[PDB]
Structure 1
Amino acid sequence: VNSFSGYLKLTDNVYIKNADIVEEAKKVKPTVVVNAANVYLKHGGGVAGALNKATNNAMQVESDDYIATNGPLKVGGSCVLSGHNLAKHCLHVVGPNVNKGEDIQLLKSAYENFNQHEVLLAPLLSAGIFGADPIHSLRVCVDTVRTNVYLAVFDKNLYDKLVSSFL
């Protein structure tokens, strides 16, 4: 049993809810919250800007030190950093950004990072301002992640559309 509440069960391991991931993280304090990161860990908007704002910019300060030491992530890659006031850990995952021309095949590689964690609170990778089709992102998630993932869809229409169209 875990603390996640109000989710619709899609599969053995994937759950979904219409929720603000920031508000959900603050309520649950999960072991792992996933950030929709870019390779520079520049957290300006969408999930990353919202998560970072909720940490009072401490996520960005930590991230800048990570990049200064290690250099940029790979598209499809990830790093584990602090979850600050939101979670124990934040798994920063870089899905491909369609609005930068990145290979959508890298979305599966991005989701494979989730398999290193038994339970996660996450957004749909490459959705929102990363420009991918969220229906596609949910299909890749279900077909790639084997650990228990609790998805936070920000848009109600998409939440209502993702459920209705789910095979």
Structure 2
Amino acid sequence: VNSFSGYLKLTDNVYIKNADIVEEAKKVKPTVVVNAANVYLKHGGGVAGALNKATNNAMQVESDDYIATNGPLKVGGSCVLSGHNLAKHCLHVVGPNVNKGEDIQLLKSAYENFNQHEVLLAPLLSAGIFGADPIHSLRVCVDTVRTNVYLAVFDKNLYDKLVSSFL
């Protein structure tokens, strides 16, 4: 039993809800919130900009130190940093950004990072401003993640389309 509320159960381990991931994280304070990161951990827009804003830019300050020490992430890769006021930890995961010409096959590699954590609150990787098809992102999530994932979909119209088209 965990404190996630109002989710539709898609499979044994995947759950989905129309929700603002920022507001969800503040309410649940999960062990792990997933950020839709880029390799530079520059949290400007989309989920990343919203999460970073909610931390009063502390996420960005921490991230800049991480990059100065370690260099950029790989597309498909991840790092664990603080969750600040939103969660215990933030798993920054880089899905491919189609608007940059990155290989969509890397989406599966990106979701594999979730398997290192027993329970996560997450967005759909590569969706929104990363330009991939969200129906595809959900399919890859369900077929790749084996740990318990609670997906927040910000857009209600998209949420309804995601549920009604789910196989």
Q: TM-score, normalised by structure 1?
A: 1.00
Counterpart in 1 of 2:100?
A: 100
Counterpart in 2 of 1:148?
A: 148
Counterpart in 2 of 1:123?
A: 123
Looking at structure 1, the residues matched to 18 and 45 of structure 2 have their Cα atoms a distance apart, in angstroms, of 19
Deviation at residue 148 of structure 1 after TM alignment: 0.1
Looking at structure 2, the residues matched to 86 and 122 of structure 1 have their Cα atoms a distance apart, in angstroms, of 12
Q: Secondary structure at the match of 1:43?
A: coil
Deviation at residue 73 of structure 1 after TM alignment: 0.0
Looking at structure 2, the residues matched to 90 and 14 of structure 1 have their Cα atoms a distance apart, in angstroms, of 19
Deviation at residue 132 of structure 1 after TM alignment: 0.1
Counterpart in 1 of 2:87?
A: 87
Offset from partner CA, 1:70-127 (integer Å, 9 cap, x none): 0000000000000000000000000000000000000000000000000000000000
Looking at structure 1, the residues matched to 157 and 95 of structure 2 have their Cα atoms a distance apart, in angstroms, of 22
Q: TM-score, normalised by structure 2?
A: 1.00
Deviation at residue 66 of structure 1 after TM alignment: 0.0
Deviation at residue 5 of structure 1 after TM alignment: 0.2
Give RMSD over aligned pairs: 0.2
Deviation at residue 56 of structure 1 after TM alignment: 0.0
Deviation at residue 29 of structure 1 after TM alignment: 0.2
Looking at structure 2, the residues matched to 165 and 145 of structure 1 have their Cα atoms a distance apart, in angstroms, of 19
* Identical aligned residues as a percent: 100
Offset from partner CA, 1:122-163 (integer Å, 9 cap, x none): 000000000000000000000000000000001111100000
Q: Secondary structure at the match of 2:76?
A: coil
Looking at structure 1, the residues matched to 119 and 149 of structure 2 have their Cα atoms a distance apart, in angstroms, of 6
Q: Which runs of 5+ in 1 are unaligned?
A: none
Looking at structure 2, the residues matched to 61 and 51 of structure 1 have their Cα atoms a distance apart, in angstroms, of 13
Looking at structure 2, the residues matched to 3 and 91 of structure 1 have their Cα atoms a distance apart, in angstroms, of 19
Counterpart in 2 of 1:7?
A: 7
Deviation at residue 18 of structure 1 after TM alignment: 0.2
Q: Are 2:61 and 1:61 equivalent residues in the alignment?
A: yes
